[PDB]
Structure 1
Amino acid sequence: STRVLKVDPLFPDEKVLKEAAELLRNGEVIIFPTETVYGIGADAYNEEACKKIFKLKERPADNPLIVHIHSFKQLEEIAEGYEPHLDFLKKFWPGPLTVIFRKKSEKIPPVVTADLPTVAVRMPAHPVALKLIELFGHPIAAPSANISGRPSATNVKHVIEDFMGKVKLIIDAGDTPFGLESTIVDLTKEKPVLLRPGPVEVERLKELFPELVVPDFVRKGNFKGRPLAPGMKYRHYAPLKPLILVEDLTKMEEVLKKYPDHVVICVEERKELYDDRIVVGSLKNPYSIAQNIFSALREAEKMGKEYIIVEGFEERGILFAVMNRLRKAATEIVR
């Protein structure tokens, strides 16, 4: 019996946010916008309400949730060992950055953290998310709003495809600004570790952290063992049709001929090269490509074609993050 309430992204109707806060108080799951992707959230201190997130997403128990906060004072409650990183955190928060810390809070149950001694924490730069958290009065545990393994919802149409009739409330604030999930950095080890590339660019983190480690699974998508964050273990971001990622574009002639029943996801500058194609954005504006990629995967899988074929991009700036997503999605990679 799902309700969809439109709110302004800058000054949302506090009445809609109070309705959402009341649902959260009742141990219900709601869907809300951020600057990255839509989230599906519960009271972070409510065990049974956080289990409902796992059940609703068809999500493996060992994939932990990000705890969304609105103030530095809430970070003092839920984490420890962060005092040396506060100057850093204050430069990027609120914003599209998630950090892994040692868990303090007795109050955040093991289901949220997948029984790990660490917690993933984000302060999102979206007035709707910040105002909801503050009105509700507890942190919100929220993964991406999508069935697990599917592309992350960046607008209410995608949320509706996955969750109509399954959640009481969806707050609609339109297309998310970035269209890609937060950068994840582990700050619990001697050297900081990138776990998921995102809108906070690898190049920027390397300026601040010369010793930043970038593990193989970030450049390949191939992690086994116990994941410390979202977006590491399992198939992700995947359309309902086989995804062929083409890193080496000189084989694009050969791929199209090997997989005849195709639609191509391509850039504006190569649009008049393919008969059937979805234009995801321009190479002159890489943020356009990040903004639309999950959308493009969802249109593409509805074109009644057997195979979705995607152009590769430079492993640089925001396109690093795009390629990480496409590699975790791809049924085949032509390199």
Structure 2
Amino acid sequence: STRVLKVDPLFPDEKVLKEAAELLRNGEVIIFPTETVYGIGADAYNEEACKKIFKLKERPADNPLIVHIHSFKQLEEIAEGYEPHLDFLKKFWPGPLTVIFRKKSEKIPPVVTADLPTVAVRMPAHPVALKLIELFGHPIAAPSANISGRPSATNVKHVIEDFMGKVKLIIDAGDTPFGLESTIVDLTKEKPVLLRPGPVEVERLKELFPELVVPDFVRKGHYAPLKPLILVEDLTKMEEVLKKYPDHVVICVEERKELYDDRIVVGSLKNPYSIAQNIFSALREAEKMGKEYIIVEGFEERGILFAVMNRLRKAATEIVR
């Protein structure tokens, strides 16, 4: 029996956050916005409560949870060996960055980290998330707000498709600013490793970390619509793809919109952050539009479109290179 409470993203009503904090203290799961995607969270120090996240998501046990913190003092309670990277953390936090550290053990139970010695920490640059964590008093473990394998929720309409009647409370702060999950950098090995591309762009990370490792699984083929996804890297095969796949809807850009039948304009190449903001919404609009096949234009493997292509490659049923 779900409550949806609208709050301002800048100065949220602290009475709405106290109610969410109370539900977290009772070991309940709630949904809250961040600058990236909506989160489905619980008390990171509550084993049983975090287990409910796994069940609500329909999620495998061996997939660990990102712990959300509000302060550098909380980092010190949960992680160790970060001291040589504090300059870097202080430069990107709060913000759309998740880092892997060696766990300080103590209170973040094994279920949160899938029995791993590492923990993924994020200090989100969203006043609602920051003020909820500070008021609750404990860090929040939160995957993206979606059924496991589905596109990450970027607004309350999507949360509701996935979770109406399953959680007591959804905080609504509207459309998430970025539409894409946080960059994930692992800092626990000889050289830093990019595990997930996001709003902290690869190009920026390569400027700071010349020796950054970007693994094959990041550049090659979660986030899946209900109808089969055809990704077209080579846009000269677009004329040919549309034919091989008759019952189609297209997702294209503003500049190529007037060149298709049933088409959803995800955004413009003039403003590529608009593409990243709306891509997940586009998969959800498209799967509803009652066509057999969803057909997506590829983008430049550069800037934020790098992260978009990363998401669409893992979504795709076929990639047309």
C-alpha contact (below 8 Å) 1:37/1:145 kept by paired residues:
yes
CA deviation after TM superposition for structure 1 residue 329, in Å: 0.2
CA distance in 2 between counterparts of 1:88 and 1:213 reads 17
Task: Find the aligned partners of 2:91 and 2:268 in 1 and give their Cα distance.
Answer: 29
Deviation at 1:18, TM superposition (A): 0.1
Q: Over residues 148-168 of structure 1, what are the superposed CA-to-partner deviations in whole Å (9 max), with x where a residue is unaligned?
A: 000000000000000000000
- Secondary structure of residue in 2 paired with 1:301: helix
| Aligned ranges 1:33-52 → 2 under 5 Å | 33-52=33-52
SS of residue paired to 1:101: strand
SS at match of 2:258: coil
Structure 1 residue 50, shift from structure 2 partner: 0.1
CA–CA separation in structure 1 for the residues paired with 2:110 and 2:296: 39
**Equivalents in 2 of 1:121, 1:145: separation in Å?**
17
* Cα RMSD after superposing both structures: 0.7
Shift of 1:116: 0.3
1:119-176 deviation digits (Å, cap 9, x = unpaired):
0000000000000000000000000000000000000000000000000000000000
CA distance in 1, matches of 2:311, 2:39: 17
SS in 2 for 1:309: strand
> In 2, distance between residues paired with 1:248 and 1:106?
50
Alignment deviations for residues 273-295 of structure 1 (CA, whole Å, 9 cap, x no partner): 10110000000000000000000
Moved beyond 3 Å, runs of 4+: none
Alignment deviations for residues 201-231 of structure 1 (CA, whole Å, 9 cap, x no partner): 0000000000000000000139xxxxxxxxx
Contact 1:62 1:114 in 2 (8 A): yes
- Tell me how far apart the structure 2 counterparts of residues 102 and 254 of structure 1 sit (CA, whole Å): 50
- Separation in structure 1 between the aligned mates of residue 114 and residue 220 of structure 2, nearest angstrom: 24
- Structure 2: 5+ residue stretches without partners: none
Give CA-to-partner distance per residue, 1:61-103, whole Å, 9 cap, x none.
1110000000000000000000000000000000000000000
Q: Which residue of 1 aligns with 2:70?
A: 70
Query: What's the TM-score, normalizing by structure 1?
Result: 0.95
> Secondary structure, in 3 states, of the residue corresponding to 2:111?
helix
CA drift at 1:328: 0.3
CA–CA separation in structure 2 for the residues paired with 1:332 and 1:61: 28
1:106 Cα offset (Å): 1.3
Query: Structure 1, residues 16-46: CA drift from partner, whole Å, max 9, x if none?
Result: 0000000000000000000000000000000
Task: Judge conservation of contact 1:80–1:104 (CA < 8 Å) in 2.
Answer: yes
- Count of residue correspondences: 321
CA distance in 2 between counterparts of 1:183 and 1:17 reads 27
Give aligned-pair identity as a percent. Answer: 100
Q: Which sections of structure 1, spanning at least 5 residues, go unmatched?
A: 223-236
Question: In the alignment, is the contact (CA less than 8 A) between 1:77 and 1:105 conserved in 2?
Answer: no
Correspondence 1:237-252 to 2 at 5 A: 237-252=223-238
Q: Secondary structure at the match of 1:100?
A: strand
User: What is the distance in 1 between the residues matched to 2:43 and 2:299?
Assistant: 39
SS at match of 1:102: strand
User: Is residue 141 of structure 2 the alignment partner of residue 155 of structure 1?
Assistant: no
Separation in 2, partners of 1:105, 1:2: 34
The alignment's TM-score, normalised by the length of structure 2, stands at 1.00
Q: Secondary structure at the match of 2:288?
A: coil
Measure the CA separation in 2 of the matches of 1:198 and 1:298.
20
Deviations 1:239-279 (A, max 9, x none): 00000000000000110000010000000000011011000
2:254 aligned with 1:268, yes or no?
Answer: yes
Distance 1:175 1:312 in 2: 24
Equivalent position of 2:165 in the other structure: 165
